[PDB]
Point group: D2
Chain length 334, copies 4
């Protein structure tokens, strides 16, 4: 079992722990947690969840300790990641989930503190490698010390872009992800570095940026420079969607698009790529641990070569699950 610490006990941080517990997985153990508050507040935030419900197991608090079923977890409050006791606690991997230490050189402070590897829960400027689990995690080597788990959007688009490109070919494509609001937006209109993201989150559709599409051109090099995209933030607390229109290299059909996703889903990317043949809506994919769930009924083909698809993602649950798969795979190279 690889030893991990969670830095930033937030939406991703807490859910990383929750997914581990809810699965019984034994390949990974969380040994410490760090945020900026009382141990008790961390425990209470874990216990009660406005999106996913109540925590399924008792949550025990002992001094500086948290226990969720398998022994106490050392809990901290250290602003500077380089001051953490990673050596003394023998941390194989630091999972960096604050939002503020995403460049390689900052994420690396965990290495200074004593962790052997670092995984940033987001795009990472200067990452030794950027990973979409199930797609390119076999590129990890003994070389990479500080890597990125990509963004929730990249983890949803890449598996779909990969299969379809392998099947039918992608000449050129444009993505708009319609995303649930997120903690880096305000409840009401207020001073912000980004004028779109300044705006009341549950009140509008809000145009926003995202490197997800170009980023896929890097986790799948064969799609270098062929995809571009943006986002629209809307009034939902959790769950998002990818709406991608692209040109196929050869003429195709709705059926062939659908079928190719099904075979991939039931075979090589099982658990990572999924699909529904039903008429579902966003909330239906709440608490689904797939990176991507392809909406069969939404496939469109215009004039042989123009293709539209829709794929869902639980931006919290799916991604937090991958943070674990990625860590277990990274620990094995140590």
């Amino acid at each position: 079992a690889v030893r991990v610490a969670i830095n930033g006990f937030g939406r991703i941080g807490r859910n990383i722990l929750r997914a581990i517990v809810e699965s019984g997985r034994t390949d990974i153990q969380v040994v410490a947690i760090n945020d900026l508050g009382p141990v008790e507040t961390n425990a209470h935030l874990l216990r009660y969840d406005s999106v996913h419900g109540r925590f399924p197991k008792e949550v025990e608090v002992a001094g500086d300790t948290i226990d969720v079923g398998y022994g106490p977890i050392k809990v901290h409050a250290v602003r500077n990641p380089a001051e953490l006791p990673w050596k003394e606690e023998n941390v194989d991997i630091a999972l960096e989930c604050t939002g503020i230490f995403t460049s390689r050189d900052k994420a690396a402070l965990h290495l200074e503190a004593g962790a052997k590897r670092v995984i940033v829960s987001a795009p990472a400027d200067g990452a030794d490698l950027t990973v979409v689990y199930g797609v390119n995690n076999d590129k990890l080597t003994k070389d990479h010390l500080v890597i990125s788990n990509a963004s929730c959007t990249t983890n949803c688009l890449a598996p779909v872009a990969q299969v379809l490109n392998d099947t039918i070919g992608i000449e050129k494509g444009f993505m708009t992800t319609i995303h649930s609001y997120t903690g880096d937006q305000p409840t009401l209109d207020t001073m912000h570095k980004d004028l779109y993201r300044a705006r009341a989150a549950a009140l509008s559709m809000i145009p926003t940026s995202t490197g997800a599409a170009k980023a896929v051109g890097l986790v799948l090099p064969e799609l270098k420079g062929k995809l571009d995209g943006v986002a629209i933030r809307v009034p939902t607390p959790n769950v998002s969607v990818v709406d991608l229109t692209f040109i196929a290299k050869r003429e195709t059909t709705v059926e062939e698009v659908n079928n190719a996703i099904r075979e991939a889903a039931n075979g090589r990317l099982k658990g990572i790529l999924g699909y529904t043949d039903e008429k579902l809506v966003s909330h239906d994919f709440n608490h689904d641990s797939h990176s991507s769930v392809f909406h069969t009924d939404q496939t469109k083909v215009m004039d042989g070569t123009m293709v539209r698809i829709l794929s869902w993602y639980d931006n919290e649950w799916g991604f937090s699950s991958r943070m674990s798969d990625t860590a277990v795979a990274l620990g094995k190279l140590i």
Copy 2:
């Protein structure tokens, strides 16, 4: 000299047709009757207080079966069958059919049986003598078109942008996703519905849904027939929608060319119908904007010189309700 009109179905659009006439100060049209399914006071109450547009900017006087908003009594009805209305007596030039239940052309045609001289449907109308997007094809109206359709809110958003961009650089093929506000045909909580998507609690999810608006551009621009398709996604906002469009241009172009061609038209031929913003705005800033379509310059992308994406906002209540009036006035002149 003003066209005499009657609103059938005093819902989100029937109310805002009236309200927009009043806010705009327009003298060319006049509402002379209103019909719905309830007491006069209830209708007045819903005109007075709006959850999305706010309070009615003027007093609303009720006296009998009548409503006064500044200019004299408006006769108010409560008749389920459209065939039974006193359109001939009250001298209705044009009935505006807004219930959402008489969009069929022979169903709309009941307003002529009842006495109106012409009919406009506030939606796509199957079998309409003509379908119109004001500013794009109101020129094709003739003295013979008797029961026309004002298209949909989404169609009035898309067609003016398609027309400009096609005239200027050429559209080969494209796909539309409208992210649209939820509407009165969806429920609060999940429940029995003919469409499995729309059965779902409306303010709780992103809800993919069906729409023929892109294909319908083909009805107002034959040049464009068969070249556009699209769908919708409804989201938890109560008003204001947006067209997100990715298409293949006939020649290489650039972000700048596209925005530019849009400004030119917005500032000239299509002033008031197609507008644009160069600022970083979000959907609520367009609440109560009367444009059919407001192009969002910043969001314009171009990939490999010929794949082009655009984003254009509409107030689905407000623009569309304003255009209902523009269309009735034009039609009125041909009577």
Copy 3:
């Protein structure tokens, strides 16, 4: 052994009764029939997928006009009027009336003609042989009671608190405001309605509304007649409500006494029906909780010894649906 039940109207109430029976594992009641006028496939889809309660955790097999949730086919019918139902053929012990259309005793009782032996209406029911809050006046049911009301979500939340506190300290006078989640009978957007309050966009406002729950407690608990009044305020949430009650005690008391009296009730006589929390929880934390009433200790207030304020949550869907079954099990024993 298990009481055999039929659900009339597979709207939300009806579906959640089923889901609650299945999720709990209980063995004392069984749904053997459903009657509804919409399509069997749509009803299965709505059982499978809930936007408030989430994914139903068992397989749902459609096989013709039948549905199987894990114990055999459940016949689904469509029969306009409840006297025409084949309740005799089907061996129904109790029809659960959940349409919202058949609430009066004489209407609900058509099910008795249709062949069933008892009827339970899932709301207040005019002229009911008895009105039940399970856990409170559960024991006043007889062999002679043939058509009953399971009262309302708010009443099942209030009566248990009122009873404990009245027994312990005494209630002279009180006023209840229930801050309630919006519900299926409110519209998405402003529109024609009998009640002008309920005409307003449901998720855009705090909306004042009347409720009969405080009167109704004076009936379940006769010693409290004329003692309690109240009203509601609907707010933009899809599920979970709360009772905010302020009353005058018969005698001086304290915060700790009030809370302590609730805990001893919840941990004994009223287990599973009235619960409490000693933590700082919010409304979503009670989503999908089967209690009728969950007392919020932290929110208890006393001033000048005798004016008391309390706060108690209810999942207005899930608690009430469980009680439907608890009530029916008991009714069955009297058959």
Copy 4:
């Protein structure tokens, strides 16, 4: 004779103080200085476009470090510590403290150190020389009060109602729950916060919370010291709030007497401050209403002559921001 003001903290309240001034046309006050934490152009952009109040009605023009709203350049700063703001230089009569971050007398008074002659805190302030609800106790101001509090939005709503009733029929004892719109100090999603309630996602729940507004009346109105207690529940609306008050009268009363004592104050000495409605309105209807408190008449109830419940609405943003200017004008005359 126009009081010169600086707005420190250009947030919901800050921006709307400026907006109410422009909109009213009033000429007794002049904003001469704005301070926040970001670029001039960002401050201007948040003034231009407002998700709750809509677009700014006048042009918002930027030149260098100044914005101009129709009446000449307002100087714009970005300075974190208030002791450094050039208040002396710029002849500031009254610094309006609106950051939420300097509410205690010693932090608020840093503005006096900087050059301002007076300070009004836009919230409860520990140690304030006086706490003012305009319309109620502003006659109590003296030339001697240097640092003052304008109370809370809730106290400005409750105090006028409490005054009228108390003066008319007496208040022995009351309890208050305010149902309140979420504000900027709550998160979009569950996250670390110093208060375990307010840590929870803001638009997802009914969230019980702490307020001193009921006690604080007790000291705009000494006759009422120690007689009222209260608490809050935040719910998923972005603006507009309500007071739900239940109290013991000093004598027997009626629904009718309670209501017309309010009408009379509202139409007489409390005009513009306390208003009322006789109609069936909902929260959104009071968006952008400048009253401090608008009494909802149909909601008055009386239990056994002496138990009285009432409901009164407040736009927590728009009403309070207007009062800030009113209070500023009064204070300025005493300098």
